[PDB]
Amino acid sequence: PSSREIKRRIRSVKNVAQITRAMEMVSASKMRRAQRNVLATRPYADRMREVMANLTARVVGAARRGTLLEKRETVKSVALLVVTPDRGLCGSLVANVLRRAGRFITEQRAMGRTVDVYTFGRKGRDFFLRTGFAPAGEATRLGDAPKLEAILGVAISAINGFQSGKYDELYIIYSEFINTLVQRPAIKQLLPVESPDISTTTNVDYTYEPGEEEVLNSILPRYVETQIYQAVLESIASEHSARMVAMRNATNNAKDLVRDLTLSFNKARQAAITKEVSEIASGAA
Amino acid sequence: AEYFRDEGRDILLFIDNIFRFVQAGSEVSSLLGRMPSQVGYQPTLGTEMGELQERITSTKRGSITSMQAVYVPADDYTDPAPATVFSHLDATISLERSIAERAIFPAVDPLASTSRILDPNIVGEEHYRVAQEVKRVLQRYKDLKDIIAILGMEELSDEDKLTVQRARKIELFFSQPFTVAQQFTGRPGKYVPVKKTVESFARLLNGEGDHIPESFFYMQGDFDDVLAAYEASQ
Secondary structure, rough: OOOOOHHHHHHHHHHHHHHHHHHHHHHHHHHHHHHHHHHHHHHHHHHHHHHHOOOOOOOOOOOEEEEEEEEOOOEEEEEEEEEOOOOOOOOOOHHHHHHHHHHHHHHHOOOOEEEEEEEEEEHHHHHHHOOOOOOOEEEEEEEEEEEEHHHHHHHHHHHHHOOOOOOOEEEEEOOOOOOOOOOEEEEEEEEOOOOOOOOOOOOOOOOOOOOOHHHHHHHHHHHHHHHHHHHHHHHHHHHHHHHHHHHHHHHHHHHHHHHHHHHHHHHHHHHHHHHHHHHHHHHOO | OOHHHHOOOEEEEEEOOHHHHHHHHHHHHHOOOOOOOOOEEEEOHHHHHHHHHHOOOOOEEEOEOOOOOOOOOOOOOOOOHHHHOOOOOOOEOOHHHHHHHOOOOOEEEOOOOOOOOHHHHHHHHHHHHHHHHHHHHHHHHOOOOOOOOHOOOOOOOOHHHHHHHHHHHHHHHOOOOOOHHHHOOOOOOOOHHHHHHHHHHHHOOOOOOOOOOHHHHHOOHHHHHHHHHHHHHH
16 A cells, blocks of 8 residues: 555566466476377377277186286275376366365275375375375376386386285276366276276187286286376376466466556555645645 | 433443544534644544543443444545544454455454453453454465465465365354344344354364355354254255
8 A cells, every 4th residue: 555565566466477477388388298198108008908808808717817807805905096296286186186085085994995095296195194194105206208117116016915915906096187178087997897998899819828827917917007107197287287277377367466456556656646745735835 | 421321321322423523523624724634634633532532431430331433434444533533442343345345244354353351351261262263364364365366275285275264264154144134135133142152163263164165154143053054955
């Protein structure tokens, strides 16, 4: 209301708007590179999925359906994969995924099953540490365009815990890239059910020179690993899109606040000039 | 009123718009030829307000439980007339335009409102604690208005998110439907006792009612009414 502090406020909010526009355009660039990486990685999973379809079609014996093919009965312990942005300002994406993880944990505890969560990205790790349930395995400081080696550190741990019986079922929650405006979480399983990509449309009997057991033992870890990679990369694209949208909204809000503060400053200036002129006129009289 | 006070009768004084007394003084003073002071006000506004207000005093013979109303010109609380009125009060309540436009019609700004009897050993320790804690959480929301407006609720810390949500639920919960405002708010009146108010706000700060969406706190009496509304809505 002093006509000078309001000028400082306008300057600060204008700086906020400018830095936010910078954030928006850089985030748009990152979102586009991430979408390009998603497209480039798509063919590998696109091929492995029908491989899983055919292998699942061939392997029907429950006894020979070992490793990740054991639909173990009397579920006790389940593991979940949560992927979060490394940094904030992502909008409501982190709130959505963390709420989804929380309701997942509550539902699993309702069934009496112990749960364990591995966190991708610092925000998930910090949230789960603050809740009081320490994650077993964490992989933070993940790059914008991560390599599959980065996700191996959690994937191999999860599958080792799966094989040893420590965990019975494996799930993953990630920010699905529905559209550049909406990025909702999506739950997926990592216990290959029937590979419903194209069901069993293809029917060609293959020879397993390593052997059925060896083939499945080698391929299923790879399939779950590429599924995790796809989820993480989709989540990165969703993160960049959500940050871009959040910064666009923040810039618009900053400009609206600039307009409001300019109106207030103008009113303050007019009032100050009126007080000035009235006082000098009264002093004249 | 002074005659009834001198006999010991407990008078209730409901003088309305004392600012109009000051304004009439300003107009007549301008006519009278006195030099104006500040924004065209009479030079003797302090003395006039003193003369009028000091007669509004509870005397050992009898007490006058006065209750005034004041009109701030435009919305400038720094105007000379309200400025002089403030120092003559024991319980100041300040109604803000911004709160009123949000349909929180009691519109009392808790931060700018206060009273002299808000003392732990006069109004009760629990009442004092609840009131001070309500002001603290609200003050925090006022501090974070700018961040919430620009960056949004998501950016700020989880503790601050909880305090902001509680502050919004508070300032909604201060809303109340009065018996005389039935024609505007279809709901009937609510005579919430002070004890129920203290308990309701203590519960709201404690956490009881955090699951309830903030919408149900609008135009409700004590916290039990909010619980009943939520349960009715499942």
